[PDB]
Design an enzyme around this catalytic site. Structure first.
Site, PDB file in Angstrom:
ATOM      1  N   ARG A 140       9.462   1.196  24.630  1.00 48.97           N
ATOM      2  CA  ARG A 140       9.503  -0.112  25.293  1.00 48.97           C
ATOM      3  C   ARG A 140       8.759  -1.110  24.408  1.00 48.97           C
ATOM      4  O   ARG A 140       7.549  -1.003  24.262  1.00 48.97           O
ATOM      5  CB  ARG A 140       8.823   0.023  26.683  1.00 48.97           C
ATOM      6  CG  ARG A 140       8.847  -1.308  27.473  1.00 48.97           C
ATOM      7  CD  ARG A 140       8.708  -0.992  28.959  1.00 48.97           C
ATOM      8  NE  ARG A 140       7.344  -0.473  29.302  1.00 48.97           N
ATOM      9  CZ  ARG A 140       6.272  -1.181  29.642  1.00 48.97           C
ATOM     10  NH1 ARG A 140       6.310  -2.521  29.710  1.00 48.97           N
ATOM     11  NH2 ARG A 140       5.123  -0.534  29.980  1.00 48.97           N
ATOM     12  N   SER A 141       9.567  -1.934  23.721  1.00 50.56           N
ATOM     13  CA  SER A 141       9.007  -2.906  22.780  1.00 50.56           C
ATOM     14  C   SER A 141       9.157  -4.286  23.415  1.00 50.56           C
ATOM     15  O   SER A 141      10.061  -5.070  23.112  1.00 50.56           O
ATOM     16  CB  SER A 141       9.793  -2.839  21.465  1.00 50.56           C
ATOM     17  OG  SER A 141       9.129  -3.670  20.556  1.00 50.56           O
ATOM     18  N   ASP A 142       8.228  -4.555  24.363  1.00 47.91           N
ATOM     19  CA  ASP A 142       8.277  -5.796  25.163  1.00 47.91           C
ATOM     20  C   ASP A 142       6.943  -6.525  25.162  1.00 47.91           C
ATOM     21  O   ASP A 142       6.817  -7.658  25.662  1.00 47.91           O
ATOM     22  CB  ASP A 142       8.733  -5.526  26.605  1.00 47.91           C
ATOM     23  CG  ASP A 142       7.788  -4.555  27.364  1.00 47.91           C
ATOM     24  OD1 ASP A 142       8.128  -4.243  28.527  1.00 47.91           O
ATOM     25  OD2 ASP A 142       6.783  -4.153  26.770  1.00 47.91           O
ATOM     26  N   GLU A 143       5.912  -5.834  24.619  1.00 49.32           N
ATOM     27  CA  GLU A 143       4.566  -6.409  24.572  1.00 49.32           C
ATOM     28  C   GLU A 143       4.291  -6.543  23.071  1.00 49.32           C
ATOM     29  O   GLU A 143       4.691  -7.566  22.490  1.00 49.32           O
ATOM     30  CB  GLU A 143       3.528  -5.574  25.317  1.00 49.32           C
ATOM     31  CG  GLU A 143       2.113  -6.137  25.344  1.00 49.32           C
ATOM     32  CD  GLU A 143       1.084  -5.336  26.103  1.00 49.32           C
ATOM     33  OE1 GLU A 143       1.541  -4.595  26.985  1.00 49.32           O
ATOM     34  OE2 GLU A 143      -0.153  -5.459  25.860  1.00 49.32           O
ATOM     35  N   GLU A 174      -0.275  -6.258  22.860  1.00 49.46           N
ATOM     36  CA  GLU A 174       0.316  -7.517  22.405  1.00 49.46           C
ATOM     37  C   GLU A 174      -0.040  -7.844  20.958  1.00 49.46           C
ATOM     38  O   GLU A 174      -1.125  -7.625  20.386  1.00 49.46           O
ATOM     39  CB  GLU A 174      -0.145  -8.619  23.386  1.00 49.46           C
ATOM     40  CG  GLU A 174      -1.658  -8.722  23.424  1.00 49.46           C
ATOM     41  CD  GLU A 174      -2.307  -8.304  24.736  1.00 49.46           C
ATOM     42  OE1 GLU A 174      -2.402  -7.093  25.022  1.00 49.46           O
ATOM     43  OE2 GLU A 174      -2.758  -9.215  25.468  1.00 49.46           O
ATOM     44  N   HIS A 220       7.211  16.909  23.458  1.00 49.48           N
ATOM     45  CA  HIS A 220       7.287  16.588  24.890  1.00 49.48           C
ATOM     46  C   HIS A 220       6.055  16.012  25.533  1.00 49.48           C
ATOM     47  O   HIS A 220       4.984  16.654  25.395  1.00 49.48           O
ATOM     48  CB  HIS A 220       7.669  17.806  25.723  1.00 49.48           C
ATOM     49  CG  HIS A 220       8.670  18.720  25.070  1.00 49.48           C
ATOM     50  ND1 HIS A 220      10.015  18.419  25.157  1.00 49.48           N
ATOM     51  CD2 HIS A 220       8.498  19.850  24.360  1.00 49.48           C
ATOM     52  CE1 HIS A 220      10.718  19.337  24.536  1.00 49.48           C
ATOM     53  NE2 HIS A 220       9.793  20.129  24.014  1.00 49.48           N
ATOM     54  N   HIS A 237       4.825   2.385  23.309  1.00 48.10           N
ATOM     55  CA  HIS A 237       4.562   1.037  23.819  1.00 48.10           C
ATOM     56  C   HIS A 237       3.419   0.457  22.986  1.00 48.10           C
ATOM     57  O   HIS A 237       2.799   1.243  22.218  1.00 48.10           O
ATOM     58  CB  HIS A 237       4.187   1.069  25.298  1.00 48.10           C
ATOM     59  CG  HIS A 237       4.226  -0.299  25.896  1.00 48.10           C
ATOM     60  ND1 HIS A 237       3.171  -0.975  26.354  1.00 48.10           N
ATOM     61  CD2 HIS A 237       5.258  -1.138  26.144  1.00 48.10           C
ATOM     62  CE1 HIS A 237       3.416  -2.177  26.878  1.00 48.10           C
ATOM     63  NE2 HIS A 237       4.716  -2.302  26.733  1.00 48.10           N
ATOM     64  N   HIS A 271       0.682   4.876  21.168  1.00 47.22           N
ATOM     65  CA  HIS A 271       0.551   3.527  21.674  1.00 47.22           C
ATOM     66  C   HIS A 271       0.038   2.597  20.580  1.00 47.22           C
ATOM     67  O   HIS A 271      -0.972   2.959  19.916  1.00 47.22           O
ATOM     68  CB  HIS A 271      -0.526   3.634  22.813  1.00 47.22           C
ATOM     69  CG  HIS A 271      -0.363   2.372  23.598  1.00 47.22           C
ATOM     70  ND1 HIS A 271      -0.812   1.140  23.182  1.00 47.22           N
ATOM     71  CD2 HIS A 271       0.227   2.262  24.821  1.00 47.22           C
ATOM     72  CE1 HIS A 271      -0.518   0.231  24.076  1.00 47.22           C
ATOM     73  NE2 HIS A 271       0.070   0.928  25.042  1.00 47.22           N
ATOM     74  N   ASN A 276      16.165  19.331  15.871  1.00 46.04           N
ATOM     75  CA  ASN A 276      16.471  18.085  16.518  1.00 46.04           C
ATOM     76  C   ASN A 276      17.586  17.298  15.852  1.00 46.04           C
ATOM     77  O   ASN A 276      18.373  16.616  16.500  1.00 46.04           O
ATOM     78  CB  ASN A 276      15.236  17.173  16.761  1.00 46.04           C
ATOM     79  CG  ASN A 276      14.478  17.642  18.032  1.00 46.04           C
ATOM     80  OD1 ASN A 276      14.775  17.131  19.129  1.00 46.04           O
ATOM     81  ND2 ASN A 276      13.565  18.569  17.825  1.00 46.04           N
ATOM     82  N   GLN A 311      10.766  13.290  21.997  1.00 40.43           N
ATOM     83  CA  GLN A 311      11.075  14.286  23.040  1.00 40.43           C
ATOM     84  C   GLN A 311      10.809  13.834  24.481  1.00 40.43           C
ATOM     85  O   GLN A 311      10.549  12.686  24.767  1.00 40.43           O
ATOM     86  CB  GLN A 311      10.441  15.657  22.761  1.00 40.43           C
ATOM     87  CG  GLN A 311      10.870  16.116  21.325  1.00 40.43           C
ATOM     88  CD  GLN A 311      10.150  17.406  20.982  1.00 40.43           C
ATOM     89  OE1 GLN A 311       9.682  18.198  21.818  1.00 40.43           O
ATOM     90  NE2 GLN A 311      10.083  17.719  19.689  1.00 40.43           N
ATOM     91  N   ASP A 312      11.087  14.761  25.399  1.00 36.51           N
ATOM     92  CA  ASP A 312      11.234  14.427  26.803  1.00 36.51           C
ATOM     93  C   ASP A 312       9.876  13.847  27.291  1.00 36.51           C
ATOM     94  O   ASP A 312       8.803  14.354  27.033  1.00 36.51           O
ATOM     95  CB  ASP A 312      11.565  15.598  27.748  1.00 36.51           C
ATOM     96  CG  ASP A 312      12.562  16.583  27.127  1.00 36.51           C
ATOM     97  OD1 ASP A 312      12.269  17.154  26.077  1.00 36.51           O
ATOM     98  OD2 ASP A 312      13.639  16.765  27.722  1.00 36.51           O
TER      99      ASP A 312
HETATM  100 ZN   LIG Z   1      10.360  21.924  22.889  1.00 40.53          ZN
HETATM  101 ZN   LIG Z   2       1.072  -0.105  26.752  1.00 44.67          ZN
END
Ligand SMILES: [Zn+2]
Ligand SMILES: [Zn+2]
Ligand SMILES: [Zn+2]
Lengths: 206, 206, 206
Positions: free
Chosen positions: A52-55, A77, A110, A74, A115, A195, A68-69
């Site tokens: 999520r590249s929104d900040e 700012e 996983h 993120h 951050h 992968n 991975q899962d």
């Molecule tokens: Zn695995």
């Molecule tokens: Zn964050």
């Protein structure tokens, strides 16, 4: 709804951006990829990941890397209210600026999280449930499961033992080295091989 | 399917409840919000969060608070088989009973979890991958990344160092205080400002 | 898209498999279940769980067990390039081979993860955010929140204190025993009772 989408207009984002994803990458339908993101070739993004590249922006994921899962990317700012770039929250890799930089052939296992501000060097394994924040992890490193790097630089070729939380440069400087006989010494290249093949296999189902 | 939905009928839930969400809150399409939940104004709920009020209930999230990616809220049963309220699993805040109470201006950062019985006071930051269970976190607190509070009360204005697992009241009583020069001293108000703006921006995409 | 689906064709998976799920199990619409998976009766799979049997396979979840929100099950490759079974990555339970074996009446609490090779014995509680990898957890065990078992065997009836990371057989041999007065001694049977009822309640909404 679309799981691949633009970031919203905010005071620090006058102009929304949509993800740039190589055609050879696979984004699971139950992953979320938002905003100013670059995803490289042959990358596999698993169910429940959230990029999520929104900040803080941009967030880059290099070639043949895997998210991975349940992995979250993120960042803090990178542009403040007045349109000023907050340099403390921006990392620089090969002369370019990023909020989060994930290099090539990197495995984010996983439930781990990276951050921004943060950078993760090529061929490094970020273990299950591990955590990287305000740090630069060198190339050919291993963060074992549940390890963490916060506010530090992890020199190339070192590993962080499972469960260890590294918060000081003095500590990061004395981490152990990856050797041929270290237990996770071949883990990342195996994961990467797997992968890349999963990304291709899953692309043939779409 | 709907990602915002009622909880199921069970022996402890004769009458299903649907979430009460302020029109100014943003619930990402890939978040899940189930059951007896109250979400306040300007709250941002990110992708992959799961707020599930189907066992212990109700779960409240106050105004201008944010529930980040992959955060789970859930709680131990608050009513047993025979319709009896299990008081040990119920928290009381401003004369009202909750399974999980998240106050106003609280940030639940990425991959953290608050499991009832639990209460989190206003203007507190719950860090990435942190954990709160059977605890009361005061106002103006900081749980650094990977910290945990289990079975305790965290006095107002204190912080829990990254990676520290607090399980005894003796330990919670001696936590350090947030001061102006502490590294996370301004973290929550920045996060809150950002997340309120993201909620508005994302609401303009719906 | 379908959240219950077959695994992709790969070099180690010539023939794709679809999950075998008992009609009495409930798979939330926002959970993901992929590949060579067996899910037993009365199992509850919560939002954001990811059960992905595409690398190491098969992954089994026994009767009356629950896979809570954000739990990941996945496993290391069990067949290498040349079609060879990698025996170090395969666990054996009651004369059968699995990548991940979750027994009957087992609770995988919120945000925990069990990564193959691994086996988890009947009536054990795997706590919130806990982690099991390359390990065999006996029956009637308790992994408290944020505990971890890596590369070890946890004898029947023992518990792992919150936050403790167990990486050696010497350590696993001296874990404490669950007794009637231990705080999590009745936790799993309560969770199991609840989750069986939630599975039925949620099945009546589908
Ligand atoms: Zn695995
Ligand atoms: Zn964050
Ligand atoms: Zn729960």
């Amino acid at each position: 709804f679309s799981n691949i989408r633009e970031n919203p207009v905010t005071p620090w984002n006058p102009e929304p951006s949509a993800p740039v994803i190589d055609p050879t990458a696979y984004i699971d339908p139950q992953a979320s990829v938002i905003g100013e993101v670059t995803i490289g070739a042959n990358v596999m993004v698993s169910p429940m990941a959230s990029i999520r590249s929104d900040e803080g922006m941009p967030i880059f994921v290099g070639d043949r890397s895997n998210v991975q899962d349940g992995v979250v990317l993120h960042a803090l700012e990178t542009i403040n209210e007045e349109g000023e770039p907050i340099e403390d929250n921006i990392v620089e890799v090969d002369g370019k600026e990023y909020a989060v930089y994930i290099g090539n052939n990197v495995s984010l296992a996983h439930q781990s999280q990276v951050h921004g501000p943060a950078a993760v060097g090529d061929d490094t394994f970020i273990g299950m449930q591990a955590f990287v924040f305000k740090s630069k992890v060198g190339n050919n490193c291993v963060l074992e499961p549940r390890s963490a790097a916060i506010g530090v630089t992890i020199p190339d070729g070192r590993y962080i033992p499972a469960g260890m939380v590294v918060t000081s440069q003095a500590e990061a400087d004395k981490l152990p080295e990856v050797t041929d006989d270290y237990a996770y010494s071949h883990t990342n290249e195996a994961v990467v091989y797997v992968n890349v093949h999963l990304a291709e296999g899953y692309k043939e189902t779409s």
